[PDB]
């Protein structure tokens, strides 16, 4: 899935819009909106640490 989302930057007063592919298994829909408005799996349980 080709997902796009907002993200923080080194400047606290600046933001950036980025995109990156994500496997469907690591994505969960919010269900409030269909066809978009996705969320990372296990995001409602803990913040994963990048290896």
């Amino acid at each position, epitope marked *: 899935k080709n997902c*796009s989302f907002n993200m923080t930057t080194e400047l606290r007063d*600046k*933001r*950036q*819009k980025v*995109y990156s592919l994500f496997y469907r298994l690591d994505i969960v829909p919010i269900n409030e909106s269909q066809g978009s408005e996705y969320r990372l799996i296990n995001c409602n349980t803990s913040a994963c640490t990048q290896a």
Partner: antibody
Amino acid sequence: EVHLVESGGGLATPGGSLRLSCAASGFTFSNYWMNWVRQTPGKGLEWIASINSAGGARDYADSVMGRFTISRDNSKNTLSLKMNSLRTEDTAVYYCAKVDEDDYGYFSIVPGDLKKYYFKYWGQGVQVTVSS
Amino acid sequence: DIQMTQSPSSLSASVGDRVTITCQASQGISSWLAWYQQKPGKAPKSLIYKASSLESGVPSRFSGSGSGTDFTLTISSLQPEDFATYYCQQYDSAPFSFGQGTEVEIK
């Protein structure tokens, strides 16, 4: 390839209301800013409005500020421009333009700000005029 | 507010003839200036986006120059497919004012 089409323009009573629509295909419509410009006879081109990718931030020229209203719907890949209290000076060929670069990158408030754009792709304008 | 002036208003040329178009800005705009050409009855087309960067697909013959307040366009070998209005537009400003529009025709 990027294809643009606009419809809804035409004759309208002076001081009334009108609605202009524009559809696009061949690209991610949810990642490009949209602008509306006019071409009056004799006098050169003139930009009248702009809208961000998400359709939240809007900006218009002082000549149409408050009278017009730009909007878009990313789900249907359509763009619109509502007209209210239009006058005889608004008769022109309205073109549905798209910016040259997508809104990705750093930004301050809205995703596409902090970047300079230009009208790279233009749709075949539609004539608009008012008379008795 | 910022305003633009374009000259010459109109001129005549021929196949292979060399002519140029120029425009000025009331205030400094660095290099955010684009050029467009519009055939009669068709929508305008982008030719040069930056002050000196040519648009993809357009013949390499085309070129531009300038910075700060003045800019110029050089058509070089005018061929029959270069006869249409040339508009000088400046961006990086709230109004994105266009030029007066200059039409080049056959002598």
